[PDB]
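Worked example 3. Consider a protein that binds S-adenosylmethionine.
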Amino acid sequence: KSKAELQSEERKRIDELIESGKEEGMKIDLIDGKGRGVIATKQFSRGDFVVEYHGDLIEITDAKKREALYAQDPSTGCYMYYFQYLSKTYCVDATRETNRLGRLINHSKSGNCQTKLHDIDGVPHLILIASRDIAAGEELLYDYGDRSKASIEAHPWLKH
Amino acid sequence: KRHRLVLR
Ligand SMILES: C[S@@+](CC[C@H](N)C(=O)[O-])C[C@H]1O[C@@H](n2cnc3c(N)ncnc32)[C@H](O)[C@@H]1O
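Given these inputs, the predicted complex is written out as structure tokens:
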């Protein structure tokens, strides 16, 4: 097949995984010191689609308004994932408790998933791809990417 | 104090 045929077929497979919301090969588990996390129940290969980071897609101005509201309740956690798409900044706000698993994945600077932007007809989606082979039973982890001194002081696990 | 997640 031509490189272009391979790319089109591959894109269609990812679009179908995003559209269907199929979240196979994973389960919630309690992780020591981290609250809930997600563990692989099957073997993943490097480059395999893992899961969407799914929540409410909003623009940066609306995200800042929601941060002010969430800050009124210290019992509410941190699920806002900021990113650039073309010339604007957006946020996937996954604060609301749903059945989706991407929002339950914990942080590591030396994890096994990499976040990628995948657009479908001009709508951005944040997806997690395996950055290496993942053994069944491993906790899924990615780098949250927050290097702020204030964040690290309040959440020391961001250092590793 | 809240942290964020950022796609760098
Ligand atoms: C997006 S949520 C991930 C799911 C979360 N553990 C839960 O039970 O809802 C982010 C929160 O998970 C916890 N967390 C993530 N990675 C961690 C880590 N490496 N060590 C400790 N806590 C972590 C912190 O409470 C963080 O604010």
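Take a moment to read the result before moving on. The radius of gyration of chain A is 16 Å. The pocket of S-adenosylmethionine is lined by residues A 33-37, 77-79, 103-104, 106-108, 157 (CB under 6 Å).
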